[PDB]
Amino acid sequence: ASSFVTISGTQFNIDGKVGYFAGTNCYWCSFLTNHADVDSTFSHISSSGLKVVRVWGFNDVNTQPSPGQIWFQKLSATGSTINTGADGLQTLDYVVQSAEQHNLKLIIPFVNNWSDYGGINAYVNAFGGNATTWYTNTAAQTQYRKYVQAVVSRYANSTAIFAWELGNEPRCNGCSTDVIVQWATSVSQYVKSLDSNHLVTLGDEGLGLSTGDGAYPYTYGEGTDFAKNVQIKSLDFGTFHLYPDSWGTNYTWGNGWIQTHAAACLAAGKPCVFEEYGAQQNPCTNEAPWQTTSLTTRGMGGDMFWQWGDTFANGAQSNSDPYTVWYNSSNWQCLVKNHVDAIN
Ligand SMILES: *[C@@H]1O[C@H](CO)[C@@H](O)[C@H](O)[C@H]1NC(C)=O
Ligand SMILES: *[C@@H]1O[C@H](CO)[C@@H](O)[C@H](O)[C@H]1NC(C)=O
Ligand SMILES: *[C@@H]1O[C@H](CO)[C@@H](O)[C@H](O)[C@H]1NC(C)=O
Ligand SMILES: *[C@@H]1O[C@H](CO)[C@@H](O)[C@H](O)[C@H]1NC(C)=O
Numbered sequence: 001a002s003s004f005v006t007i008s009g010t011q012f013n014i015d016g017k018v019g020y021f022a023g024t025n026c027y028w029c030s031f032l033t034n035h036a037d038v039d040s041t042f043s044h045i046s047s048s049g050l051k052v053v054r055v056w057g058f059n060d061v062n063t064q065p066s067p068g069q070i071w072f073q074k075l076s077a078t079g080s081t082i083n084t085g086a087d088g089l090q091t092l093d094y095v096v097q098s099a100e101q102h103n104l105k106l107i108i109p110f111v112n113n114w115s116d117y118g119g120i121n122a123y124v125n126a127f128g129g130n131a132t133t134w135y136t137n138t139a140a141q142t143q144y145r146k147y148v149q150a151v152v153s154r155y156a157n158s159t160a161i162f163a164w165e166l167g168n169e170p171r172c173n174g175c176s177t178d179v180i181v182q183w184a185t186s187v188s189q190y191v192k193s194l195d196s197n198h199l200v201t202l203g204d205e206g207l208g209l210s211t212g213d214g215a216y217p218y219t220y221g222e223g224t225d226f227a228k229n230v231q232i233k234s235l236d237f238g239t240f241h242l243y244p245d246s247w248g249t250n251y252t253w254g255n256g257w258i259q260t261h262a263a264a265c266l267a268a269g270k271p272c273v274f275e276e277y278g279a280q281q282n283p284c285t286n287e288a289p290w291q292t293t294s295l296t297t298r299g300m301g302g303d304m305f306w307q308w309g310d311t312f313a314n315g316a317q318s319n320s321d322p323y324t325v326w327y328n329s330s331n332w333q334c335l336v337k338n339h340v341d342a343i344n
Contacts, residue, residue: 001015001016002015002159003015003016003159004159004161004197004198005105005159005161005162005163005198005199006199007199007236007237007270007271007301010265010266010269010270010271010298010299010301011271011301012162012237012271012301012302014051014052014105014162015103019343020295020300020301020302020343021051021052021301021302021343022049022050022051022052022302022303022304022336022339022340022343023050023051023052023053023054023105023107023302023303023304024045024050024052024053024054024304024305024307024308024325024336025053025054025275025276025304025305025306025307025308026041026045026053026054026055026307026308027054027055027056027307027319028056028318028319029041029042029053029055029095029308030055030056030057030059030091030092030095031056031059031070031091032091032095033070033087033091034312034314035094035098036312036313037312037313038094038095038098039098039101039102040310040312040313041308041310041318041327042098042099042101042102042104043102044310044327044328045102045104045308046102046103046104048327048332048336048337048340049337049340049343050104050336050340051103051104051105052104052105052106052107052162052302052304053099053104053105053106053107053308054106054107054108054109054275054276054304055092055095055106055107055108056108056109056112056117056168057072057092057108057109057110057151057165058072058073058109058110058111058112058117058118058119058147059071059072059073059117059118060072060073060074060075060111060112060117060118060119060122060123061073061074061075061118061122062074062075062076062118062122062125062126067087068087069087070087070088070091071083071087071088072088072089072092072147073118073143073147075118075122075123075125075126075127075143076126077126077127077139080126080143080146082146082147082150084150089150089151089154092151092154093154096154096155096158096160096161099160100158100159100160104160105160105161105162106160106161106162107162107163107165107201107273107275107304108151108155108161108163108164108165109165109166109167109168109203110144110147110148110151110164110165110166110167111123111144111147111166111167111168112167112168112169113167113168113169113170113171114168114169120134123137123140123143123144124140126139126140126143127139127140127143131173132172132173132174132175132179132223135172135179135180135183136179136183144187145187145190148187148190148191148194149194152164152191152194152195153194156194156195156197156198157197161197161198162198162199163198163199163200163201163236163237164191164195164198164199164200164201165200165201165202165203165239166184166187166188166191166200166201166202166203167202167203168203169203169204169205169241170184170202170203170204170224171204171205171207171222171223171224172222172223172224173221173222173223174221174223175223176223177208177220177223177224177225177228179223180204180223180224180229181225181228181229181232184202184229184232184235185232185233185234188200188202188232188234188235189234191234192234199236199237200234200235200236201235201236201237201238201239201273202229202232202235202238202239203239203275204224204226204229204239204240204241205217205222205224205239205240205241205242205276206224206226206238206239206240206241206242206257206261207219207220207221207222207224207226208220208222208224208225208226209225209226209227209260209261209264210227211260211263211264212256212257212260213253213256215247215248215249215253216247216248217247217249217257218260226238226240226261226264227264227267227268230264230265230268230270231268236270237265237270237271237272237273237301238261238264238265238268238270238271238272238273239272239273239275240257240258240261240272240273240274240275241275241276241277241306242254242257242258242274242276242277242278242290243276243277243278243306244279245278245279245280245281251279251286251287252289254277254286254289254290254293255289255290255293258274258290258293258294258297258300259293259297261274261299262294262297262298262299262300263299264299265299265300266298266299271299271300271301271302272299272300272301273300273301273302273303273304274290274294274300274302274303274304275303275304276304276305276306277290277303277304277305277306278305278306278307278322278323279323280322280323283323283325283331283334283335284330284331284334284335287305287335288334288335288338288339290303291303291335291339291342292342295339295342295343303339305325305335305336306323307320307321307323307324307325308324308325308327309324309325309326309327309329310326310327311326311327
């Protein structure tokens, strides 16, 4: 079957099947200009047994790029432009087309917390203030909502959308945690006013949760309170990410990070998605146990490793980083095929 992705009890219902899912992150999929590269990458993800792919829904610039370069939105104080051209949201249109074709569903965030592909920084450059006043900067929010509408309206009736995502890892460094609560409440309500077919999620890392061991990620220094955010009515499921290497914690501490988040989700009556995770050292040994913890913990509805790597018909490889798991590699065997086999 096909149909819209929904929540059934505390699990996801994908194409009529209720149950745990595995997926992956492929931010770079959105920016592929050769259609054949999207298709081969998506054929590999689908043949691996993964059901969901996380792709950027943004590509923000302050200056128009060199002709032919991809850009989805140009942020300016004197009038912003949303690019619906061939070098614009038409590349995201094909990603959605290919997902429909390959039986995949997509998680699509609307703006980056980080300056990669512009992010909140690009809005700051156009509209003033800074990274934390962004959330309540009227001109910035007005353009952000116009972009939301430009993306959402394209795919609202597509069955390929798993969920709309407010942003990639939104933080408000040192802010009261209410700044994000209010912003998320308002934006998620707006998203729901545009599309009543699809799920909506925050896209936060999960920071701020008092049931843990007091390490920094559990503290409230980044303006987010996980339990508060996940109780927002217009958000259907929680998201949380995990990077011990960037956070100063060891790898095995990741198990408790999953468990606490899963409990918080279930306490709010909703599923959690373990949406990004990676380990730079020995990923097979350090990440396999996280996969098993998520698969075996009540309240977890699925997990998406950070990040797919693949290669194209012309010999070019995809964008990558130290976390990339290359299709068909040893780590693909360990972290993809063996995990997918275990879900069966
Ligand atoms: C951001 O702007 C607000 C309001 O001026 C200010 O209170 C806060 O200190 C600023 N942040 C930084 C990091 O300068
Ligand atoms: C598309 O989805 C909206 C709900 O978000 C619904 O109101 C509308 O009828 C659908 N469009 C078509 C053409 O079915
Ligand atoms: C890692 O961290 C926890 C404390 O968070 C500690 O109890 C455990 O012994 C440590 N494990 C390794 C392998 O370092
Ligand atoms: C992946 O691996 C199999 C060998 O297991 C091979 O048949 C196929 O060509 C490979 N696909 C790619 C993209 O290399």
